[PDB]
Write a protein that binds this DNA or RNA. Structure first.
Lengths: 185, 141, 131, 57
RNA sequence: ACCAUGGUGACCACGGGUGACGGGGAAUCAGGGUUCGAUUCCGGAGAGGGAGCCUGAGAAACGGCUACCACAUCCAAGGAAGGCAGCAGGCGCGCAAAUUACCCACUCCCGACCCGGGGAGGUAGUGACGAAAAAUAACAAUACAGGACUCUUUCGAGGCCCUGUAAUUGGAAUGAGUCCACUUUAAAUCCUUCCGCGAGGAUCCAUUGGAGGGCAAGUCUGGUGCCAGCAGCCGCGGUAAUUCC
């Protein structure tokens, strides 16, 4: 019949009741303080922060030294230690229940390029990343929601094909050296 | 009192299958006579030709004339009335056009103050009713 | 030429097929994706034959420029390059002629021969004059 | 009479037509969220009056 | 064939129905459950309807045959040939579903077989079923309105941050688009890469619904006066309508 994949799942989740005023205001001031496009990509990372807390809280109703609690629980924690949301010396299955939504929005590319000083005015970081200026070590990436790890966190910089790291100016500086040199010397 | 002992699961399961025939939304979905009776025949929309405009009168607290038609279908053709759900849009429809009547909002019960209409008109003559109302589309030439 | 560097990796030779097969990655900072025939002469100066037994294909530029990567292979001889080679990559640099009819004709030709038995004088001229 | 079956579309056909004029376009998407994160939250309104809503008149 | 009178059943037989193909599964989600499962995997059934056979290890085979039934083609009227629930497509039914395209290069299969064939399958066209990423602007110099930072003070305005008017600009900003060349593939297309063009109402124009309550948002103005209409529900409308237009 077909060698097609067939597999996909949704990433976000719609809220249970809508229009309640205390939610969509405190969930509004995430859309501007970390600079996002719409509430789907808050509902994205909320569902990410949900299922981790689902998995971790399932690991507390287990008895101690349970073989899959020791394996899968520790592999969980080093997965959110390598991404830089959980500081390493305090690794427990109980400190993860205190992790909130605000610490996943810090580990994006789009705001690890604001605080590193590569850009100002967080909405300007989308105007730099998506408009193809900013690389991770040898791979330029136009994605705001690129959750940058802690290892490759020192190596955010502009790129070599990029204007800010190389040359060959774009069509407006080339026009500005043309608008005086197109009808005269 | 009810049964409880480790042997009565035939009695309890047989007592449940015959007492579920006493709420409506199991009975109209599993007896079969309720879907051999609705004009849609278990579908969501239906085309049918317009026989006659009729103006029904709203409920007692209110006082107006709700604009309606007398559509007779093409799928196992049956006589129904349908509402024209807009301000001026009865004037778009004429004699023996074909219209796509839809459900009207609360599963075969009448909404609003129109006494006993069950259906509403969208898409007269294959052009949308909101498109006619907003000036997007028109009748053929 | 100037800054187009030919790294390769996962080298493997075999006397099953008399080829040398390896994974090629080409690192080019500020150019377009380099041609196949621009590179297959650069393997002629790495494994020291002539650019006739080097077939390079499957080049896939990564996002943002820089490292495109492909697969390439080198036979031991040209008479080995004709035997155990698929006929299309042998035609990358013209060495095989596959210009036939479309397959819609060849089926109808086969179904028109099918209605004629035995008469070899008409089993071949089965509607070949009407052109 | 009481509007029997004729004069369908009575009040639509006799409302006077005021033309839909134009303004500068609204910003779409991400920049639209910026201009209302600023309007509701970062700008503390020093005046009172039981904190009247954004469409007040 | 000759004898025996047995078997099943309210622990639901038997008969009927099913919008009944069964399952791995899917949606749901406290636990118990509810509902779907024609559909790529396994198995079964059938090629218009029933039936009978031939060959063959394996068929009661239908892109095999014989006959009836049903439907239908050609005829020079003596006869002939039919079976798309295969791929495209056509009519028809409908609320409701893609091109009479490219190739065996890939995954496998069959054969006398390193070589032939495969509408299996692969590739593209259609594709807002659906799912994942993700543009439609960002910084400034005035600028007008606010901030625990300013004088020995509600003096006087700010050298300092944020916002919005309304700007004027600009510049190692860029895409959608255009278009060479590669790359891509069986051949092409895409996608990635890359020259060259490509933004000041960036007019290179974001919509669909709402604004009485549930339920987030106006008692703003004009019109209509239980009329036209709205309203899933409660309700709004009879000359100032926070609900119609």
């Amino acid at each position: 019949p077909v060698a097609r994949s067939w597999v996909c799942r949704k990433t976000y989740v719609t809220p249970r009741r809508p229009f309640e005023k205390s939610r969509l205001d405190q969930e509004l001031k995430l859309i501007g303080e970390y600079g996002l496009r719409n509430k789907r990509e808050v509902w994205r990372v909320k569902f990410t922060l949900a299922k981790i807390r689902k998995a971790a809280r399932e690991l507390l109703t287990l008895d101690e030294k349970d073989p899959r609690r020791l394996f899968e629980g520790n592999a969980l924690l080093r997965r959110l230690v390598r991404i830089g949301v959980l500081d390493e010396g305090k690794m427990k299955l109980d400190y993860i229940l205190g992790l909130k939504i605000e610490d996943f929005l810090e580990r994006r590319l789009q705001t690890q390029v604001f605080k590193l000083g590569l850009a100002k005015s967080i909405h300007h970081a989308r105007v730099l990343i998506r408009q193809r200026h900013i690389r991770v070590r040898k791979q330029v990436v136009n994605i705001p929601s690129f959750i940058v790890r802690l290892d490759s966190q020192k190596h955010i910089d502009f790129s070599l094909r990029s204007p800010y790291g190389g040359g060959r100016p774009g069509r407006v500086k080339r026009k500005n050296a043309k608008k005086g040199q197109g009808g005269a010397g | 009192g009810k049964c409880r002992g480790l042997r009565t699961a035939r009695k309890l399961r047989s007592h449940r299958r015959d007492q579920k025939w006493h709420d409506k939304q199991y009975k109209k979905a599993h007896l079969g006579t309720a879907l051999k009776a609705n004009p849609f025949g278990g579908a969501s929309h239906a085309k049918g030709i317009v026989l006659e405009k009729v103006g029904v009168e709203a409920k007692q607290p209110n006082s107006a004339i709700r604009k309606c038609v007398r559509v007779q279908l093409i799928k196992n053709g049956k006589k129904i009335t349908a509402f024209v759900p807009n301000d001026g849009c009865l004037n778009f429809i004429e004699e023996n056009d074909e219209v796509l009547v839809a459900g009207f909002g609360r599963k075969g019960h009448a909404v609003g103050d129109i006494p006993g209409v069950r259906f509403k008109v969208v898409k007269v003559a294959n052009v949308s009713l909101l498109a006619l109302y907003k000036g997007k589309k028109e009748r053929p030439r | 030429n100037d800054t187009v560097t030919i790294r390769t990796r996962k080298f493997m030779t075999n006397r099953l097929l008399q080829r040398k097969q390896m994974v090629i990655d080409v690192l080019h900072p500020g150019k377009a994706t380099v041609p196949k025939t621009e590179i297959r002469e650069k393997l002629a100066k790495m494994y020291k034959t002539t650019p006739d037994v080097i077939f390079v294909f499957g080049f896939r530029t990564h996002f943002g420029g820089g490292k495109t990567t492909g697969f390439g292979m080198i036979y031991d001889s040209l008479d080995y390059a004709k035997k155990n080679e698929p006929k299309h990559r042998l035609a990358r640099h013209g060495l095989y002629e596959k210009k036939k009819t479309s397959r819609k004709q060849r089926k109808e030709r086969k179904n028109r021969m099918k209605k004629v038995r035995g008469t070899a004088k008409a089993n071949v001229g089965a509607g070949k004059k009407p052109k | 009479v009481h509007g029997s079956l004729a004069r369908a579309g009575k009040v639509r056909g006799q409302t006077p037509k005021v033309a839909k004029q134009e303004k500068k376009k609204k910003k779409t998407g991400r920049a639209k969220r910026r201009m209302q994160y600023n309007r509701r939250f970062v700008n503390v309104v020093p005046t009172f009056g039981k904190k009247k809503g954004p469409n007040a008149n």
